[PDB]
From a paper:
Here, we report a thick filament structure from the indirect flight muscles of a third insect order, Hymenoptera, the Asian bumble bee Bombus ignitus. Flightin is essential for maintaining insect flight muscle structure and performance; when flightin is eliminated in Drosophila flight muscle myofibrils, defective myofilaments are formed and flight is severely impaired. Flightin sequences vary in length but have a strictly conserved region in the middle, dubbed the WYR motif that spans over ~50 amino acids that are critical for normal flightin function. The C-terminus is embedded within the backbone based on evidence that deletion of the C-terminus results in filaments of irregular length, whereas deletion of the N-terminus produces filaments of normal length but in flies that cannot fly.
The non-myosin protein flightin reveals a newly resolved extension at the C-terminus that overlaps a previously unassigned density in both Drosophila and Lethocerus. Here with Bombus, we observe for the first time what appears to be the complete density of the part of flightin embedded within the thick filament from the C-terminus deep within the backbone to residue 41, the first part of flightin stabilized by contact with the proximal S2. The shape of this density strongly supports its assignment to flightin due to the presence of a folded domain in the middle in the predicted position of the “WYR” motif. For flightin, AlphaFold2 predicted a reasonable atomic model for the WYR domain corresponding to residues 56 to 102. The model of the two ends of the flightin density was rebuilt de novo using Coot. The density corresponding to the residues on the N-terminal side of the WYR motif of Bombus flightin, similar to that of Lethocerus and Drosophila, passes between the myosin tails of one curved layer to reach the outside of the backbone. The WYR motif itself is situated at the inside of the myosin tail annulus, where it contacts two curved myosin layers. The density on the C-terminal side of the WYR motif passes across a pair of myosin tails of one curved layer and ends up contacting yet another curved layer on the N-terminal side. Flightin’s interaction with five different curved layers possibly explains its impact on determining filament length. Our more complete density of flightin resolves the identity of the so-called “blue” density first seen in Lethocerus thick filaments and later in Drosophila.
Residue numbers in the entry: 41 to 151
The structure:
Amino acid sequence: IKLEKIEPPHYNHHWVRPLFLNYAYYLYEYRKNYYNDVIDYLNQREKGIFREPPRAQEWAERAMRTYDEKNTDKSFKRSADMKYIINMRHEPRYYSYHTRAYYSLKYQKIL
């Protein structure tokens, strides 16, 4: 059996330098999403309080929920975004003026 053809194998790095890198920064925050929300609802319901059964969730909505969980700064200035439409004024306006007293002990008699 002749006429063997080979391709360059491996190309393993000869000057060592393999290095390593941890990856828990993103995997944990994304893996945790599927299981926690369900289980965090399963056990919390087991605690004795009810809410909506687990709906199937789409990636963007799950990311939004994780973002809401992460932002510990539960900004009260969303209520500021609303008081852009609020801060109502002049509801207790008067436009009526005072009555004074045009009295000099007038007598209408009878009564």
